Amino acid sequence: TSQIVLPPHLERIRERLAENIHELWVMNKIELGWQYGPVRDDNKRQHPCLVEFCKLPEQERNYNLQMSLETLKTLLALGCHVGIADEHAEEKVKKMKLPKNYQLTSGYKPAPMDLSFIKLTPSQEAMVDKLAENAHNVWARDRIRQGWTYGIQQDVKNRRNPRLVPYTLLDDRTKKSNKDSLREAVRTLLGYGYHLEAPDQDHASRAEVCSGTGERFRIFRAEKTYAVKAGRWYFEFEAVTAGDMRVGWSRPGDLELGSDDRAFAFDGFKAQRWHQGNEHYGRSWQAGDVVGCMVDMNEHTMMFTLNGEILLDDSGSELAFKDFDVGDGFIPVCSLGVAQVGRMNFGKDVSTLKYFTICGLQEGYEPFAVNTNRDITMWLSKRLPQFLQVPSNHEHIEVTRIDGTIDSSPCLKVTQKSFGSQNNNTDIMFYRLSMPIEYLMQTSTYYYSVRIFPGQEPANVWVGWITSDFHQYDTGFDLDRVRTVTVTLGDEKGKVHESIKRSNCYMVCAGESMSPGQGRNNSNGLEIGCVVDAASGLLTFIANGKELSTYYQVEPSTKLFPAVFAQATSPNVFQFEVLWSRMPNQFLKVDVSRISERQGWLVQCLDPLQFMSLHIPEENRSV
Amino acid sequence: CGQLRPSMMQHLLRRLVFDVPLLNEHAKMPLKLLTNHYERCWKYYCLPGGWGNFGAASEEELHLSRKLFWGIFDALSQKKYEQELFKLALPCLSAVAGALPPDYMESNYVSMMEKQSSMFNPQPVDTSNITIPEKLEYFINKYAEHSHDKWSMDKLANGWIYGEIYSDSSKIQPLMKPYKLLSEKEKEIYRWPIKESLKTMLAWGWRIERTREGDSMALYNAAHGYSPRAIDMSNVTLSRDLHAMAEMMAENYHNIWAKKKKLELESKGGGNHPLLVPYDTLTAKEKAKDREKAQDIFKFLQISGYVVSRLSAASRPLCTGGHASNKEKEMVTSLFCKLGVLVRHLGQTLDARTVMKTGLDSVKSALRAFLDNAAEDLEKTMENLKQGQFTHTRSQPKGVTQIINYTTVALLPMLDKHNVYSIYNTRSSRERAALSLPANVEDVCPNIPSLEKLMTEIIELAESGIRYTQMPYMMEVVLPMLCSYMSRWWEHGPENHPERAEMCCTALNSEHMNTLKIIYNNLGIDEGFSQPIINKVKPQLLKTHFLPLMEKLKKKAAMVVSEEDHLKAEARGDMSEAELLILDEFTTLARDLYAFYPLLIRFVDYNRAKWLKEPNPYWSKSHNFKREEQNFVVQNEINNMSFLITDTKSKMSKAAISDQERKKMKRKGDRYSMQTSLIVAALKRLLPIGLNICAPGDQELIALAKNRFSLKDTEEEVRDIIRSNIHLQGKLELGIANVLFHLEQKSKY
């Protein structure tokens, strides 16, 4: 908490306030029960802080003035107005506050004041919490600078202080003393005639209740082969935590559920449905509630039974959806928001269903999975991106292979394909496309390349190679290269030998500035396709005519389909001469059972498991 | 739907602003009405600016259809997009300011609910004595070099090459030389448009940005080293302020060109050109040139980072809505003071009516707008508005102001700081003057008002004015004492004893609750600290004393019994919010009484069901309800078999009988749907008796509706007559129809 510096305009009131409150603390210390001592010793019940202002050392007074100044600057710069409203009852006004309560001890003791009849505003509690947090922060940084009562590489002493974390590692029971001191201080400040406001209230929206975006969205779906064509099927979805839970039926064939007409969903968090827009229908549920999505292909009506009660919209219609095409059937679908837990029940057993006798049996309803002898199988959205997709139809992709290498060979490959966008398309995506296409005095073979037009450079488009495993789909990239993982294998006794350095999923050159020439046109020797005749861990794939220490020596067996990185809006820069995460995926069905026991944390698995992979040609398939 | 911009309404406006057509204005209003819906709200880019400029230039004109078009457009613009006002706040404020001088004629000055969005110049500027500051050293030279390179590259594309001797036949251009050695005339020609643009931009006055990170002069990828290059810098999106600056520069350029055309036409002594056309009327042929010029200006201003640029967190400091609300309060207060000074000792009443229709109501969802608009001055402004409305309704009202007053008073329950401002003095004075409505029927009221004050209007207004069901907001100083006074007065008088045309005096108070033959006066005199209503002994004693009154309340009369039952229900309402769950035995007793009272009421035949306009919604109660339903089903079946044969008189009697039966069915079905949830919850677990009792009722209901025509045709007129609808099916906690959620729940079993 350090925003601005207190201006030197309130120096007189600041000094008067500091002097009287310091007097208040030193009388409080005097009346605590200790006594003044010429020397410092805890065994004699003597404390150096119990010294009157006339005999206090200069260092202690300077430290007191400094902490008073820092605290006043913090409370002034927090955001609340701390202007003078009522004058203090010292040498300016007399309001009988000081002689209200008087105490006599063995020494000088003036009459203090204690005003507690005023209402305890939450602003005082906020001030106390902020001051305690500031004290914990300065204590933690003081410990960090000097390394006291802990040790990482030194271990000077044991019994580490739990003061490192100012909020979680510290409990209010341990900090009762300074909490009480802060409460007394703010009570005396209230008694002095000072007005304060609480920002964390309904008057001002200074606090944020939700923070997030459309990320980490998982859609749970069933098999495409389990679609239905007739009859009525019932299933229950027990909602545990209220939140974004869109439940309905999806038609097979990233995207938010219910955005278009492919799938239907319902949710009570906003108590409205999603089908090609926003329509008010139904009501909010609570914890331990079911939805009960119904389907009836005989007359194409959809309804929902919330705890045995049919939900109705504002128009008083019992049918949620009407006049929809049958298509290739519908399958159960669920959506789970951030920190939300669901519970599916396809109807394996009659006794498992809760709200089934109330509405199901009388109307002639059957569970969705009442006839299946085997366990049901369900899919989920794959959060990890994969490159195993060729872009067939997109919003602005018009790929068309043209071959003109016969006779006329201007660029050998002679291929044109429109890959640029139209307008409002910038979400940093990485492109990948399929490839259905010793000698003396030679330089390199396989003279093929992907054409680009580096005449604009909107965001310093990077060019380089790509490894087999890329799971770093993030907006920010090319700032750390994941990690420069190095291997120092060897004897490691008195000499290090054969310390071969490895590489992570980072084979893309930065290409910030090849040369300060600024050549015209667009052809400047871009990503020339060159492969060394003999494999030695070095490949010549660069977009510049000069070498800049980018050898990147690694192990062989890395060649795959081409992929390049780019970011723009609509310059039609990408030509030939996508990462998705909405693909369904199933985790497991034969998950093992593990047993954990106290005092050892033993885990046992006596059931072996086995599964195989694919053997598709081109010698690369395992999904 | 248009492609990029329409040019129809501009032509329609240009034709309506003059009276060349005669009786032809009716051939374009349907065109405008049809084309308004075709075009979306995103097609209005320059049209709102021209509309605002024309409204500011002239507010009152002979074009009465303009307000109709504005109202239609604003009513049809209430979509789900919820577009921002942006530039709409100025024309609405100007119209509000200028609407006072107009008098009253036509209905064009009534539909003000759309206000506040439900919440040639030949010489524009003069640069005769404007000097360009000498802040240019390098960027102008770079721009001139780029322009020369582009021009020479364009001339090279045509087939011109650099040479030493100029020759048009050989296509030789010796101008391919650096700008440091170019001719003075060519340099001046190239510099003149740039100098004029710089002078125009510096004439108005705007901030200039000189950030060091904007140095993008050389960032994109012949003789004396002449190597021209082509740079495509039109792919960069630019801010809206620079777009507006470029639009203003283009407008100035077009005005200058039009002035030059006018000068060259005047010098020739004759001629005309059809190019004197505004931007919104321009065609694509000149639109392409305008877009090219705008792109060139954007590319010119994008290099070197030259960007041209032009309070407290409260409604008063910077929010336009808070300013508009405060201003509207100011004018309504000024008008109220003027009316109270002049009238109280022509178009004034008209403008007063317009400003009370517009000032009092601004949005249908007034509660959310008030909650999200302000919290400090909202209460005092509402209190001032209520006081002004009360003072204006004190005198004789000409028009009907009941609905607007009810809408204004309904916003009180949905805290207000009544300690800062006390505006309850007028309400307390009115309550004191009307402390006994059956007893103060005399000339005590000023001017002897037969219907201005001594009528049902004040009784109906008191229901909406006093409503604290959600949370109390009064000072709790005189309101509890006044409530105790009204309770004591109603206790003293068991009958109504009202005046003529005042039978519905039950709907008078909606806050009959504790601390919200009495000895209240003695307690107040003795205390005058703690009010006697603070103790819970007094409400309990009052309830125990009152209980025999409705315990023994049973009469066979028609109107006096009905009005006594209504008064007992109102004075003993079930909204006991003072710890309802704590007094479990009292709650059960009240529920039993309020469930047994309708049974004893409906025990009689009750051929007339118009006495109760809207009645207030265990095993013994369920059995009694089932017995009553079975008895009424038997009676209805008997009536059906009696009316099957022995045809009655003309259709008037049959229609009246069917209407009475429909009213009785609706009245019974209200309670049936109210108790259906409880019956279903009782029968769901282990009770089959409820279903076994409801099955004959469902069978009788199905048989009655199996074949009926007179009921079918009279249901429509019964629903039309009873405009009040409850619609309690959606709450799940023509008031009712034949088939609703209750029927589906009953048939579900």
Side-chain angles (χ1 to χ4, degrees), chain A residues 1-373 375-377 379-381 384-412 414-416 418-450 452-482 484-505 507-511 513-519 521-579 581 583-618 620 622-623, chain B residues 1-152 154-175 177-184 186-216 218-228 230-232 234-239 241-244 246-247 250-265 267-271 273-279 281-284 286-310 313-317 320-327 329-332 335-336 339-345 347-349 351-363 366 369-371 373-375 377-378 380-382 384 386 388-401 404-406 408 410-413 418 420-422 424-426 428-434 436-454 456-467 469-470 472 474 476-482 484-487 489-498 501-507 509-512 516-518 521 524 527-528 531-532 535-536 538-539 541-551 553-560 562-567 569-571 573 575-576 578-580 582-590 592-596 598-599 601 603 605-606 608-611 613 615 617-618 620 622-625 629-632 634-636 641-643 647-658 660-661 665-673 676-683 688 690 692 694-699 701 703-705 708-711 713-715 717-718 721-722 726-727 730 735-738 740-742 744-745 747 749:
Chain A
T1 64
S2 289
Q3 292 145 264
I4 56 171
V5 186
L6 187 138
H9 183 224
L10 267 74
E11 55 182 2
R12 198 266 311 275
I13 173 66
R14 181 256 165 194
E15 189 59 68
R16 287 307 300 127
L17 262 170
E19 272 289 322
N20 57 61
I21 62 178
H22 160 81
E23 267 279 305
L24 182 65
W25 334 136
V26 295
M27 319 304 78
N28 272 350
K29 285 164 206 163
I30 282 183
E31 69 96 22
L32 195 140
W34 291 317
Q35 217 184 3
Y36 66 99
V39 297
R40 50 174 185 87
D41 42 352
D42 191 75
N43 202 6
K44 210 183 178 181
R45 287 174 177 262
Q46 315 304 315
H47 276 79
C49 279
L50 272 77
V51 174
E52 292 180 353
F53 176 66
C54 291
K55 322 179 209 83
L56 272 171
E58 206 267 331
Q59 277 212 255
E60 186 55 69
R61 185 58 200 154
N62 181 56
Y63 163 69
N64 198 291
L65 208 74
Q66 263 296 317
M67 51 175 172
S68 302
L69 169 75
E70 289 294 326
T71 49
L72 286 173
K73 185 209 304 305
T74 316
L75 59 94
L76 190 139
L78 185 70
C80 291
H81 286 175
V82 289
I84 293 151
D86 295 327
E87 204 72 53
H88 49 94
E90 284 183 354
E91 95 185 2
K92 284 149 197 193
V93 81
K94 198 58 71 167
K95 292 277 194 67
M96 70 46 60
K97 291 200 277 174
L98 273 78
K100 189 257 181 183
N101 184 27
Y102 181 55
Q103 205 171 2
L104 190 58
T105 183
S106 83
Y108 293 100
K109 184 59 68 58
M113 38 83 68
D114 277 322
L115 195 59
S116 79
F117 317 120
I118 203 165
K119 170 68 177 69
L120 189 60
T121 48
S123 62
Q124 311 307 307
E125 311 270 2
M127 282 293 150
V128 163
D129 194 85
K130 284 152 193 160
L131 274 165
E133 275 294 306
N134 278 220
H136 296 335
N137 286 344
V138 300
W139 260 341
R141 71 182 63 251
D142 176 46
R143 289 312 182 276
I144 282 167
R145 293 298 182 272
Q146 75 189 356
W148 198 37
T149 72
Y150 74 96
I152 301 104
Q153 292 258 38
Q154 49 183 358
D155 205 6
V156 288
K157 56 168 291 293
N158 224 337
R159 190 62 264 169
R160 58 173 287 270
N161 48 333
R163 232 178 299 272
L164 279 170
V165 179
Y167 190 66
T168 307
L169 272 189
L170 249 175
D171 283 302
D172 214 8
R173 192 61 170 274
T174 318
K175 53 181 172 180
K176 49 190 279 287
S177 65
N178 56 3
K179 168 79 181 93
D180 200 4
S181 82
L182 262 50
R183 173 74 172 87
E184 192 265 334
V186 300
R187 196 199 306 270
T188 48
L189 285 175
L190 286 177
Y192 288 157
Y194 290 155
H195 181 80
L196 213 44
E197 301 108 327
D200 45 355
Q201 267 207 295
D202 195 74
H203 311 125
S205 309
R206 250 79 155 171
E208 193 177 3
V209 295
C210 283
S211 287
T213 180
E215 210 66 40
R216 269 82 173 200
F217 194 50
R218 281 187 186 168
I219 298 101
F220 287 79
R221 210 188 71 190
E223 293 280 329
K224 288 180 139 170
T225 68
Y226 287 168
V228 297
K229 283 318 163 52
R232 278 87 64 193
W233 316 100
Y234 173 64
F235 73 105
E236 313 185 340
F237 173 57
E238 308 274 348
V240 177
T241 312
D244 200 47
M245 296 203 178
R246 316 270 165 197
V247 185
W249 293 82
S250 176
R251 209 188 275 140
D254 286 347
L255 190 64
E256 198 265 330
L257 182 54
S259 311
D260 89 10
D261 45 351
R262 197 193 89 178
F264 316 135
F266 155 88
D267 175 31
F269 161 76
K270 276 186 297 170
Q272 63 104 29
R273 72 212 204 173
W274 278 78
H275 175 69
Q276 211 175 4
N278 270 335
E279 293 294 327
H280 193 268
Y281 160 86
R283 87 193 187 198
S284 163
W285 51 77
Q286 277 304 115
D289 278 13
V290 300
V291 185
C293 307
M294 301 335 278
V295 279
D296 196 355
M297 291 315 198
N298 309 279
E299 52 255 22
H300 318 91
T301 77
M302 314 265 289
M303 61 175 68
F304 301 86
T305 70
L306 197 142
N307 300 132
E309 295 291 327
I310 315 162
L311 300 157
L312 275 80
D313 60 325
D314 293 331
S315 296
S317 63
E318 318 182 325
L319 322 173
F321 310 97
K322 184 66 177 176
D323 279 294
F324 54 92
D325 63 288
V326 179
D328 54 351
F330 290 126
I331 39 154
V333 57
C334 178
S335 278
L336 293 188
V338 192
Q340 295 173 205
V341 174
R343 191 186 306 164
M344 269 295 189
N345 212 23
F346 285 107
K348 194 82 209 60
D349 291 276
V350 179
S351 64
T352 317
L353 304 181
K354 332 278 211 183
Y355 296 88
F356 188 41
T357 314
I358 296 154
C359 68
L361 275 79
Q362 307 67 60
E363 285 190 282
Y365 295 154
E366 281 294 314
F368 185 59
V370 76
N371 272 22
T372 305
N373 275 309
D375 203 288
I376 197 61
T377 48
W379 307 80
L380 55 99
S381 186
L384 275 303
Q386 289 91 14
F387 279 99
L388 290 163
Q389 329 74 347
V390 191
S392 66
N393 51 312
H394 210 195
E395 81 272 333
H396 202 263
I397 290 301
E398 299 302 311
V399 56
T400 291
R401 297 292 180 91
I402 300 166
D403 217 346
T405 185
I406 314 153
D407 291 331
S408 286
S409 182
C411 54
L412 209 56
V414 195
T415 309
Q416 290 87 16
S418 291
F419 277 32
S421 176
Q422 180 51 253
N423 182 237
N424 278 281
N425 262 346
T426 174
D427 291 273
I428 176 64
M429 82 285 278
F430 321 127
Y431 286 95
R432 182 207 186 106
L433 60 175
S434 63
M435 260 198 299
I437 295 165
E438 202 272 335
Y439 183 50
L440 76 155
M441 51 66 58
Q442 90 165 357
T443 312
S444 282
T445 59
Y446 266 98
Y447 283 153
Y448 71 102
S449 67
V450 186
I452 210 164
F453 290 142
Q456 303 299 112
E457 291 288 328
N460 196 19
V461 161
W462 306 262
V463 54
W465 260 121
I466 173 53
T467 189
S468 62
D469 303 336
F470 216 69
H471 295 339
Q472 269 82 9
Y473 186 39
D474 193 74
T475 293
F477 101 102
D478 206 76
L479 79 157
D480 51 352
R481 269 88 184 147
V482 188
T484 45
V485 166
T486 62
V487 178
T488 60
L489 198 144
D491 213 5
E492 295 162 28
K493 301 296 204 268
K495 186 176 172 66
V496 169
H497 45 71
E498 289 98 15
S499 75
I500 318 161
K501 287 170 59 182
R502 216 207 281 182
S503 186
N504 284 6
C505 48
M507 280 320 186
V508 188
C509 177
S513 53
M514 57 226 69
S515 68
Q518 304 307 112
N521 313 303
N522 297 276
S523 296
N524 293 79
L526 56 97
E527 52 259 18
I528 174 169
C530 286
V531 49
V532 191
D533 203 278
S536 67
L538 168 72
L539 212 53
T540 42
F541 215 49
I542 47 175
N544 49 359
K546 36 189 66 63
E547 195 261 338
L548 66 160
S549 164
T550 65
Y551 298 127
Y552 275 10
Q553 299 314 105
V554 280
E555 285 319 291
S557 194
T558 322
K559 275 78 61 181
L560 76 161
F561 288 92
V564 77
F565 296 162
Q567 202 277 151
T569 64
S570 285
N572 56 89
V573 69
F574 197 46
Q575 304 279 92
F576 183 50
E577 186 265 327
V578 58
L579 279 187
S581 299
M583 28 196 60
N585 171 80
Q586 72 181 14
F587 210 161
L588 266 175
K589 290 306 152 286
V590 195
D591 299 80
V592 292
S593 67
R594 310 168 314 255
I595 295 100
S596 304
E597 59 104 27
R598 190 59 171 168
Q599 202 50 59
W601 294 112
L602 259 178
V603 279
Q604 314 185 129
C605 286
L606 268 302
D607 293 6
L609 274 197
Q610 281 178 353
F611 82 116
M612 51 313 286
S613 314
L614 271 303
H615 59 75
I616 314 174
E618 301 299 284
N620 41 4
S622 285
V623 299
Chain B
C1 171
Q3 198 263 327
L4 58 61
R5 199 205 34 84
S7 316
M8 329 322 194
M9 61 305 288
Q10 284 85 238
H11 284 108
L12 204 148
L13 168 75
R14 206 167 291 109
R15 296 291 92 75
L16 69 84
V17 288
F18 204 71
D19 205 1
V20 154
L22 266 302
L23 256 283
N24 184 37
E25 68 270 14
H26 322 282
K28 288 187 283 299
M29 303 330 87
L31 165 61
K32 173 168 277 291
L33 285 179
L34 188 51
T35 199
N36 269 329
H37 312 119
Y38 284 164
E39 297 280 34
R40 65 189 174 210
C41 298
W42 287 334
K43 301 274 145 162
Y44 282 3
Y45 286 160
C46 61
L47 188 51
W51 192 349
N53 278 125
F54 288 147
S58 77
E59 277 285 335
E60 190 81 8
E61 271 295 317
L62 78 157
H63 320 105
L64 303 173
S65 62
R66 292 297 97 198
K67 185 259 169 180
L68 200 57
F69 151 72
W70 158 72
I72 285 298
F73 164 66
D74 209 354
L76 265 301
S77 64
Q78 268 291 100
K79 59 207 301 185
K80 59 104 177 178
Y81 265 118
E82 203 66 37
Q83 301 288 104
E84 64 258 43
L85 276 80
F86 193 46
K87 282 290 286 295
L88 193 136
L90 277 79
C92 72
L93 184 56
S94 305
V96 159
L100 257 283
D103 285 3
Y104 53 108
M105 86 320 281
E106 285 78 273
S107 266
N108 234 356
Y109 299 67
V110 162
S111 314
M112 299 313 81
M113 275 343 295
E114 283 94 9
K115 194 53 69 184
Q116 312 273 125
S117 183
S118 180
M119 181 45 188
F120 187 72
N121 317 299
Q123 296 296 110
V125 286
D126 197 20
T127 58
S128 61
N129 300 129
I130 299 298
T131 73
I132 299 174
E134 281 294 319
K135 62 208 303 161
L136 55 95
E137 276 169 347
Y138 62 97
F139 71 96
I140 177 62
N141 296 343
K142 287 179 188 290
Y143 294 151
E145 212 161 343
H146 202 178
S147 308
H148 197 243
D149 291 329
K150 283 286 178 288
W151 173 82
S152 292
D154 170 54
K155 98 189 163 65
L156 192 139
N158 283 107
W160 292 68
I161 206 165
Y162 168 68
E164 282 97 355
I165 310 297
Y166 181 72
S167 170
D168 280 306
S169 173
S170 303
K171 274 197 167 174
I172 301 298
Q173 193 68 263
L175 294 174
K177 63 185 72 177
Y179 212 88
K180 295 185 179 183
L181 294 174
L182 262 170
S183 163
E184 286 288 325
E186 190 172 1
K187 167 170 62 66
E188 276 293 320
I189 283 169
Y190 288 165
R191 191 179 169 88
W192 191 252
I194 309 173
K195 268 186 66 181
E196 209 268 337
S197 176
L198 285 177
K199 214 184 276 280
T200 51
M201 281 315 78
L202 287 157
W204 279 292
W206 278 304
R207 309 184 265 197
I208 297 174
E209 205 162 2
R210 214 188 288 270
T211 43
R212 216 76 42 85
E213 281 288 324
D215 44 355
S216 170
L219 190 63
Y220 302 95
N221 307 115
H224 318 284
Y226 174 62
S227 55
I231 293 170
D232 202 2
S234 179
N235 216 19
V236 187
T237 310
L238 206 56
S239 80
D241 196 13
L242 296 189
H243 279 63
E247 281 305 303
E251 199 183 3
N252 207 343
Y253 277 143
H254 280 90
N255 282 19
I256 288 170
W257 191 37
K259 187 70 175 301
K260 185 176 71 66
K261 183 175 72 67
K262 282 197 295 305
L263 257 67
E264 78 186 3
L265 277 182
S267 297
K268 283 174 215 156
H273 214 267
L275 209 49
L276 195 69
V277 172
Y279 282 164
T281 305
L282 285 192
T283 72
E286 56 261 20
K287 263 188 263 188
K289 186 256 291 180
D290 212 11
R291 291 297 99 193
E292 198 264 331
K293 190 220 282 185
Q295 279 191 334
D296 176 46
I297 287 160
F298 288 151
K299 189 197 300 304
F300 186 81
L301 216 50
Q302 193 267 331
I303 304 287
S304 81
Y306 285 164
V307 173
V308 168
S309 52
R310 173 67 208 90
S315 79
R316 305 305 303 125
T320 310
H323 298 166
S325 186
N326 284 262
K327 291 300 188 293
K329 278 301 290 195
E330 209 272 323
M331 290 67 78
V332 76
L335 185 132
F336 279 17
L339 261 69
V341 160
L342 194 139
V343 185
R344 285 191 180 93
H345 296 89
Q348 283 76 241
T349 68
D351 59 63
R353 284 274 154 169
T354 58
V355 302
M356 61 66 68
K357 279 293 193 294
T358 310
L360 287 175
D361 278 338
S362 176
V363 57
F370 285 163
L371 272 162
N373 187 58
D377 53 350
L378 152 73
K380 58 183 284 297
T381 45
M382 161 145 58
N384 173 42
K386 289 300 291 180
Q389 275 162 280
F390 282 149
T391 50
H392 278 293
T393 50
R394 269 192 298 117
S395 57
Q396 182 250 304
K398 171 131 182 63
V400 187
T401 173
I404 170 67
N405 220 308
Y406 298 156
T408 305
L411 313 178
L412 288 166
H418 207 279
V420 192
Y421 292 99
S422 183
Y424 198 69
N425 49 2
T426 318
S428 73
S429 78
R430 293 298 97 76
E431 276 161 333
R432 187 55 250 190
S436 299
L437 193 138
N440 293 132
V441 53
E442 61 255 9
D443 300 337
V444 62
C445 298
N447 309 306
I448 318 173
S450 184
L451 281 185
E452 312 167 2
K453 298 294 289 184
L454 201 60
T456 320
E457 195 263 336
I458 178 174
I459 317 167
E460 290 289 319
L461 185 54
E463 279 281 326
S464 305
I466 295 99
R467 213 201 293 273
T469 45
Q470 174 61 250
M474 74 303 288
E476 309 260 12
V477 173
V478 288
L479 191 138
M481 198 33 78
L482 259 293
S484 83
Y485 276 179
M486 251 38 58
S487 67
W489 184 245
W490 285 122
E491 186 255 333
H492 279 295
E495 288 193 357
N496 284 30
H497 299 142
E502 276 175 68
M503 45 292 313
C504 50
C505 280
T506 71
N509 206 298
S510 58
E511 204 182 1
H512 206 251
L516 268 184
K517 57 104 174 178
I518 204 65
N521 313 284
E527 288 295 322
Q531 190 56 256
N535 205 25
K536 317 182 294 181
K538 267 216 176 158
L541 194 139
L542 259 65
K543 279 284 178 287
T544 49
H545 179 263
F546 286 163
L547 272 182
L549 194 54
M550 48 310 300
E551 184 43 61
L553 194 140
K554 34 182 180 67
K555 286 196 290 183
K556 257 76 156 182
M559 78 88 78
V560 51
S562 299
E563 71 184 1
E564 275 181 23
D565 167 67
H566 294 146
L567 190 136
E570 189 265 330
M575 48 66 77
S576 44
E579 292 177 355
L580 188 139
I582 297 301
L583 308 175
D584 278 311
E585 53 179 0
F586 265 51
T587 313
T588 51
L589 278 159
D592 275 20
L593 283 184
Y594 298 153
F596 288 153
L599 174 87
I601 278 158
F603 178 55
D605 179 80
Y606 275 8
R608 313 286 189 271
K610 57 161 283 302
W611 313 116
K613 308 300 198 183
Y618 295 128
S620 56
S622 83
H623 288 337
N624 290 319
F625 183 74
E629 190 53 66
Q630 211 274 337
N631 283 256
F632 198 76
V634 161
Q635 273 178 302
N636 274 33
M641 43 152 197
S642 72
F643 283 153
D647 286 337
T648 62
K649 282 299 180 184
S650 185
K651 57 186 186 304
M652 161 56 188
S653 300
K654 271 281 287 204
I657 287 161
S658 291
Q660 286 172 283
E661 270 195 335
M665 201 36 48
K666 285 182 183 198
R667 276 190 65 214
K668 211 188 189 306
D670 193 20
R671 295 205 313 269
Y672 182 77
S673 65
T676 306
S677 67
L678 275 79
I679 286 166
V680 161
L683 68 93
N692 276 312
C694 204
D698 295 10
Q699 191 172 350
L701 196 61
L704 274 156
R708 38 153 194 86
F709 181 64
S710 69
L711 200 52
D713 58 63
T714 49
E715 264 159 17
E717 60 93 19
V718 163
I721 283 173
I722 312 295
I726 298 155
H727 284 91
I736 204 167
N738 197 4
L740 279 180
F741 168 71
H742 63 90
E744 188 74 33
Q745 191 78 275
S747 55
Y749 287 110

